Design a protein around this ligand. Structure first.
Ligand SMILES: Cc1cnc(-c2ccc(C(F)(F)F)cc2)n1Cc1ccccc1OCCC[C@@H](C)CC(=O)O
Ligand SMILES: Cc1cnc(-c2ccc(C(F)(F)F)cc2)n1Cc1ccccc1OCCC[C@@H](C)CC(=O)O
Lengths: 255, 254
């Protein structure tokens, strides 16, 4: 695959990204820099004016992280389907890739609707302050704060949508997911994306130093972020018998 | 939209292939090569950069080579004229020719062939199927299979205009290894097949079941070339004096 092929590869992947996600970084930045601030119980309740029956604040906020996560999984599945060589993989490989890398994607993208004071919710019509989310009882708060920690260090790399389209595709087409059927083919496609990614960054961030290796580490940082997250998800599955989990996320944390 | 599609692709054919089925039939109906004499005579009394002569079958084998290589360049130019093949990834363009040229070359073999042999030397010579059977193994086993096929496929009584489309659907197979953009190739294929489908209806009205028989024929050729690549391996191993044009080492490497 030539430099030109990879250039055209990026217009394709970017197009899939624009067609498919409702919230780009362009739409978010412009909103953030100038929605309803949800900073406490009065504000949440107001902002509420089909989730499980409301039990308690920390828990209902938990359920809204579920309603948002679910929505994004569907977005990425579509996004994955529009990646050039993905529709043409074993379906078992298509599911395994989604099942193991969607959460890395979600948290890489969450950085985009995040800043240091909180995040945009509800298609950018709401804003939940970092503080208020810090204030829900453990173990919910302790599942939310590390993702913020990550995001703030990641928006420092100052990436745009056309860069995130490739970063994200690189994460889904990861050929180390366990139980893959055709590992070398995935590894092919992945490598073609990290190559297209390498050239894109030369064009679009030419003074930027060391960007590519910086990005590969954050890929690794994400694996453990998800590892540390999945752990906590399991701790909720056990310590919080009353609290439920959408069956779409039941089959994700299945194995 | 489909009828225009056909005329275009047919023009790419006549532009790019010197020997069409039409030329080939109206001769078949040339100097016969049937033995060592006629061949050595052909080789001195027909004019058509070869390895120093080692033996007769190896020489025949390098002739096959001389020719398959030349047709691989024709199929290459020809594809540059199948609509939107040029606007695929150049690495996909390569992957399609590499894995598809031979299926193409043997579909087209049937055009210059009959039961008794093939035309050679751009129409000047005729080589009997007997003489080619005559040669020693592995060189006999490589040849005959094509002939069966060429004969049975010929009984479908296609013309060039059908061929020019069949050819393209064969190149445009989004089922090759290492294809980045599968569903784009599948879609150009789809258009080609629909065009060949309407073409057939228009060209061969009373003919029942012609199009689906064509799709098995496209299947058949993948298997044939699978056995042909198997067989070539036998020759990279056992015919160790006997070289292979670099361009073919390229296509077979994997
Ligand atoms: C990615 C995301 C996008 N929007 C939200 C989000 C919007 C509004 C509200 C609410 F308004 F309820 F506060 C809560 C959250 N999040 C969740 C989010 C953000 C920052 C830190 C941790 C987050 O969730 C971790 C827990 C998610 C799991 C329940 C489900 C799973 O893991 O699959
Ligand atoms: C397609 C074709 C067109 N013309 C010839 C041909 C013309 C003149 C003479 C002669 F007799 F002169 F040597 C031999 C052959 N052929 C070859 C052909 C015909 C019928 C059956 C098997 C055939 O080749 C299989 C072997 C091809 C490989 C060496 C290289 C490769 O696999 O790419």
């Amino acid at each position: 695959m030539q430099v030109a092929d990879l250039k055209a590869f990026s217009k394709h992947i970017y197009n899939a990204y624009l067609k498919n996600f409702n919230m780009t970084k362009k739409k978010a930045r412009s909103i953030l820099t100038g929605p309803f601030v949800i900073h406490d119980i009065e504000t949440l309740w107001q902002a509420e004016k089909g989730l499980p029956p409301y039990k308690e604040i920390s828990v209902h906020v938990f359920y809204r992280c579920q309603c948002t996560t679910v929505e994004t999984v569907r977005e990425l599945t579509e996004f994955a389907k529009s990646i050039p060589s993905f529709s043409s993989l074993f379906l078992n490989d298509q599911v395994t890739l989604l099942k193991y890398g969607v959460h890395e994607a979600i948290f890489a993208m969450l950085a985009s609707i995040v800043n240091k004071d909180g995040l945009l919710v509800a298609n950018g019509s709401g804003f939940v302050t970092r503080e208020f989310l810090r204030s829900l009882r453990k173990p919910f708060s302790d599942i939310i704060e590390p993702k913020f920690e990550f995001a703030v260090k990641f928006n420092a790399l100052e990436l745009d949508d056309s860069d995130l389209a490739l970063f994200i595709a690189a994460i889904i087409l990861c050929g180390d997911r366990p139980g893959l059927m055709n590992v070398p083919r995935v590894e092919a496609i992945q490598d073609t994306i990290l190559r297209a990614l390498e050239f894109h960054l030369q064009a679009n961030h030419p003074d930027a130093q060391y960007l590519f290796p910086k990005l590969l580490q954050k890929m690794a940082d994400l694996r453990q972020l998800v590892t540390e997250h999945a752990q906590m998800m399991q701790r909720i599955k056990k310590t919080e018998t009353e609290t439920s989990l959408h069956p779409l996320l039941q089959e994700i944390y299945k194995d």
